[PDB]
């Protein structure tokens, strides 16, 4: 809320940065350091981003329900944080994107 309001007022970041913080504050490295200097897999990782508390509402019961899920992202930390969220919740996953090579794509 504050990142949005502050950046809304601070000012292509008017689209991009607001997207970045909507996706997850810590994609901006410095705010990660400020909010959580240790940079570890803390619960703050969830607390600071509504979209993943939603995943706490979904992916647990979802896995428990015997279902599988695909999902699509913006690059950089937008995906890497998921790896952390998934590891924090012991949600086994795979990850594929432009940086991976055709062998492991297959």
């Amino acid at each position: 809320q504050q990142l949005y309001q502050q950046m809304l007022k601070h000012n292509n970041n008017k689209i991009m940065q607001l997207r970045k913080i909507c996706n997850h504050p810590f994609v901006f490295d410095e705010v990660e350091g400020v909010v959580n200097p240790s940079r570890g897999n803390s619960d703050l990782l969830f607390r600071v981003a509504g979209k993943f508390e939603l995943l706490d509402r979904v992916l647990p019961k979802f896995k428990a329900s015997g279902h599988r899920v695909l999902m699509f992202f913006q690059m950089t930390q937008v995906m890497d944080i998921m790896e952390d969220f998934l590891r924090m919740k012991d949600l086994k996953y795979m990850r594929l994107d432009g940086s991976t090579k055709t062998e492991e794509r297959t």
Partner: peptide, 12 residues
């Protein structure tokens, strides 16, 4: 909100 004191710096 909570920790606005340090957040008041990161916004810079």
């Amino acid at each position: 909100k909570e920790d606005s004191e340090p957040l008041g710096r990161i916004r810079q």
